[PDB]
Write an enzyme that holds these catalytic residues in place. Structure first.
Site, short mmCIF file in Angstrom:
data_model
loop_
_atom_site.label_atom_id
_atom_site.label_comp_id
_atom_site.label_asym_id
_atom_site.label_seq_id
_atom_site.Cartn_x
_atom_site.Cartn_y
_atom_site.Cartn_z
N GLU A 1 -81.41 40.05 9.06
CA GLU A 1 -81.12 39.37 10.29
C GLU A 1 -80.30 38.31 9.72
N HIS B 1 -38.72 9.72 27.73
CA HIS B 1 -38.14 9.15 28.99
C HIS B 1 -39.13 7.99 29.09
CE1 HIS B 1 -38.71 8.15 33.51
NE2 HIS B 1 -37.31 7.87 33.11
N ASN B 2 -38.59 6.78 29.46
CA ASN B 2 -39.40 5.38 29.32
C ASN B 2 -40.27 5.39 28.44
OD1 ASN B 2 -37.60 4.81 31.33
ND2 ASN B 2 -39.17 4.89 33.12
N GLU C 1 -36.12 5.17 24.57
CA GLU C 1 -35.65 4.45 25.59
C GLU C 1 -36.46 3.07 25.85
OE1 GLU C 1 -35.73 6.53 29.53
OE2 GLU C 1 -34.62 8.20 28.62
N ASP D 1 -36.28 -0.45 28.07
CA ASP D 1 -35.87 -1.02 29.05
C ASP D 1 -35.96 -2.50 29.03
OD1 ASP D 1 -35.63 1.36 29.81
OD2 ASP D 1 -36.72 1.40 31.50
N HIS E 1 -40.95 -1.55 32.76
CA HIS E 1 -40.26 -0.74 33.64
C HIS E 1 -39.67 -1.51 34.77
CE1 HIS E 1 -40.17 2.76 36.57
NE2 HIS E 1 -39.15 2.76 36.00
N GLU F 1 -31.46 0.00 27.92
CA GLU F 1 -31.22 -0.21 29.44
C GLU F 1 -31.32 -1.76 29.45
OE1 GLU F 1 -34.06 1.17 32.07
OE2 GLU F 1 -32.62 0.70 33.83
N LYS G 1 -27.41 3.75 22.11
CA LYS G 1 -26.83 4.15 23.13
C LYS G 1 -26.93 2.99 24.43
CE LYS G 1 -26.83 6.41 27.46
NZ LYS G 1 -27.44 6.07 28.49
N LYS H 1 -24.13 0.55 27.18
CA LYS H 1 -22.78 0.17 27.75
C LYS H 1 -22.00 -0.60 26.66
CE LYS H 1 -24.31 -0.12 32.66
NZ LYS H 1 -24.05 1.08 33.62
N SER I 1 -25.62 10.59 32.01
CA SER I 1 -26.95 11.00 32.28
C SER I 1 -27.17 11.57 33.58
CB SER I 1 -27.82 9.69 32.08
OG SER I 1 -27.57 8.98 30.69
N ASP J 1 -65.49 31.10 30.27
CA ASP J 1 -65.65 32.58 30.85
C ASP J 1 -63.96 32.65 30.96
OD1 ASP J 1 -68.19 32.83 31.57
OD2 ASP J 1 -67.67 31.81 33.52
N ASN K 1 -68.81 34.20 29.91
CA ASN K 1 -69.74 33.73 29.27
C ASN K 1 -69.64 34.14 27.73
OD1 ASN K 1 -71.83 32.64 31.00
ND2 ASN K 1 -73.00 32.45 29.41
N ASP L 1 -60.49 28.55 31.39
CA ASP L 1 -62.08 28.74 31.54
C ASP L 1 -62.14 29.01 33.07
OD1 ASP L 1 -64.41 29.02 31.64
OD2 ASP L 1 -64.98 27.28 31.19
N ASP M 1 -62.96 29.54 36.89
CA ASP M 1 -63.85 28.87 37.78
C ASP M 1 -63.53 29.28 39.04
OD1 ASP M 1 -66.61 27.43 37.56
OD2 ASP M 1 -65.63 26.33 39.22
BA LIG Z 1 -70.13 30.57 32.32
BA LIG Z 2 -66.40 28.79 34.00
BA LIG Z 3 -35.14 3.69 31.62
#
Ligand SMILES: [Ba+2]
Ligand SMILES: [Ba+2]
Ligand SMILES: [Ba+2]
Length: 513
Positions: A1, A112-113, A142, A144, A157, A191, A239, A241, A279, A410, A434, A463, A465
């Site tokens: 075993e 982005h941002n 980026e 701002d 932002h 920006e 980058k 103006k 852009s 599962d 299982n 998994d 469900d």
């Molecule tokens: Ba289960």
């Molecule tokens: Ba499950």
């Molecule tokens: Ba921006």
């Protein structure tokens, strides 16, 4: 075993089989037999004794077999679980592409941002957000900028309740991390909503903080094209103006003049200059790709285009980048903070080329005289259909997605093709109930891919469900040309891009023309 159970736990038939086929009757794989495996099964192009021998030296556990140029089943498994057994090409996990073309010829990892950690309306901002992104290989960030107290510009932002941070603090973080993941140029999108005075302050900080990393003068001899990543190696570029705006700043914008989209011309009028960047919102881009697909593509050969998420994505959700890449769009900005399939694909793409953040576009997307239009496919070099067969064999130590730490997974596996519209497809396996330790599906899928150069293969484990949405367990996205054949293991990543040490899928991939 203590062997039975023990080693029965730790025991994989599919592996036994594979070895058997490889080794046949022998209890060992001889360098000759290994080479045959590497070639016939793994389809290695550098298949040969040298390869075989390094695999044995690298992965064989038995001193005897090692010394004697042989591989045991154990070394076989080690190999298969190694970076060499990875379904994601180890060779592409280092910069290996041509880094000497104009920037417009590469796809560039863009954020982005960047300053934001959560939503676009009231979540927090933090320098950490910039560090994280840079650590994920992001090249395009980026900022701002708004006037802040004590003549110190801030970042947040505009017109929202997002938390704030200092422009200077941001700059230091960037300076400290800009090249931790890649040596190639970082681009900072400013920006600018600052008063003239504070604009002056920004410029001071830029120069003071970035120091010599900052690119503040054209490159010598760079005259008709954008420089290459190699030429801008170790630099940060701005980058914004270029001449409301102080010279101190305007004079720092060299190759990335923020510009309003004119249209697509051709000669030396309209279709903007190489050193100028337009852009497009997610929506405008789609429409343009929709109506002027080939114009955009062609436009994108010599020019950098930035795409950004639709305004309604105040949750910082992301669009699919693939659709933009298909048009040759390079600076496809996503919300790096948001886990999802979109970022999964994004980072799968950028894991390529050593994860340097600049991935060379396919040739047809670098041909100014291109008739390609991913939306209206005709014959051309881009057309090279392939027949892909993926066999999802078994799963090993699938993480528990978390939940009331008592139930067992599962698991089911989804395999997707992302690329030109005609190639996009998805298939799923059955659910094994299982078992996250060693579910076995032994299911195969086949896909036809006409424009592989733009494709990506994604493996997703959920998994299951009945009562609700399935929990995401792990994922992995591989760019077509990095997809390795034969028996391999797919190393699963978490929502956040983290590597799952022992969660894998064992698969057999085959690509044929
Ligand atoms: Ba289960
Ligand atoms: Ba499950
Ligand atoms: Ba921006």
């Amino acid at each position: 075993e203590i062997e039975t159970f023990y080693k029965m736990l730790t025991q994989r038939a599919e592996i036994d089989r594979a070895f058997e086929e490889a080794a046949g009757s022998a209890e060992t794989l001889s360098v000759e037999r290994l080479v045959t495996f590497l070639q016939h099964q793994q389809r290695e192009e550098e298949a040969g004794p040298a390869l075989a021998l390094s695999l044995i030296e690298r992965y064989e556990p038995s001193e005897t077999a090692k010394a004697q140029r042989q591989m045991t089943k154990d070394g076989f498994l080690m190999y298969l679980l190694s970076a060499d057994g990875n379904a994601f090409s180890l060779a592409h996990r280092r910069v290996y592409q041509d880094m000497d073309q104009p920037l417009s010829h590469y796809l560039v990892s863009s954020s982005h941002n960047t300053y934001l950690l959560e939503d676009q309306l009231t979540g927090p901002s933090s320098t950490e957000a910039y560090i994280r992104a840079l650590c994920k290989g992001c090249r395009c960030l980026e900022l701002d900028c708004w006037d802040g107290p004590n003549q110190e510009p801030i970042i947040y932002h505009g017109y929202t309740f997002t938390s704030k941070i200092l422009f200077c603090d941001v700059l230091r973080a960037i300076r400290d991390y800009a090249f931790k993941a890649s040596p190639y140029p970082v681009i900072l999108s400013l920006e600018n909503h600052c008063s003239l005075e504070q604009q002056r302050v920004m410029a001071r900080h830029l120069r003071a903080i970035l120091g010599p990393i900052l690119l503040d003068q054209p490159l010598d001899g760079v005259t008709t094209s954008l420089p290459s990543p190699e030429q801008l190696k170790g630099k940060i570029l701005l980058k914004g103006k270029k001449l409301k705006l102080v010279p101190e700043l305007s004079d720092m914008i060299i190759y990335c003049k923020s510009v309003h989209f004119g249209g697509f011309s051709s000669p030396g009028t309209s279709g903007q200059a190489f050193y100028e960047m337009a852009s497009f919102s997610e929506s405008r881009a789609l429409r343009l790709l929709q109506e002027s697909g080939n114009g955009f593509v062609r436009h994108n050969v010599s020019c950098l285009s930035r795409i950004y998420p639709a305004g309604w994505r105040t949750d910082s959700s992301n669009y699919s980048p693939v659709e933009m890449w298909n048009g040759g769009c390079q600076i496809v900005a996503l919300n790096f903070q948001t886990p999802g399939p979109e970022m999964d694909v994004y980072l799968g793409c950028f894991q390529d080329n050593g994860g340097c953040g600049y991935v060379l576009k396919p040739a047809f997307l670098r041909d100014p005289n291109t008739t390609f239009n991913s939306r209206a496919l005709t014959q051309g070099p881009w057309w090279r259909p392939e027949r892909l067969r993926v066999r999802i064999i078994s799963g090993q130590q699938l993480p528990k997605v978390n939940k009331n730490k008592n139930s067992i997974v599962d698991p089911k596996v989804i395999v997707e093709i992302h690329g030109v519209g005609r190639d996009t497809g998805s298939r799923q396996t059955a659910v094994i109930t299982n078992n996250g330790f060693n579910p076995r599906w032994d299911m195969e899928f086949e896909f036809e891919v006409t424009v592989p150069d733009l494709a990506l293969v994604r493996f997703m484990v959920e998994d299951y469900d009945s009562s609700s949405k399935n929990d995401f367990i792990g994922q992995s996205t591989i760019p077509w040309n990095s997809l390795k054949q034969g028996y391999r293991h797919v190393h699963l990543l978490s929502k956040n891009g983290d590597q799952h040490p022992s969660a894998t899928l064992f698969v057999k991939i085959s690509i044929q023309d």
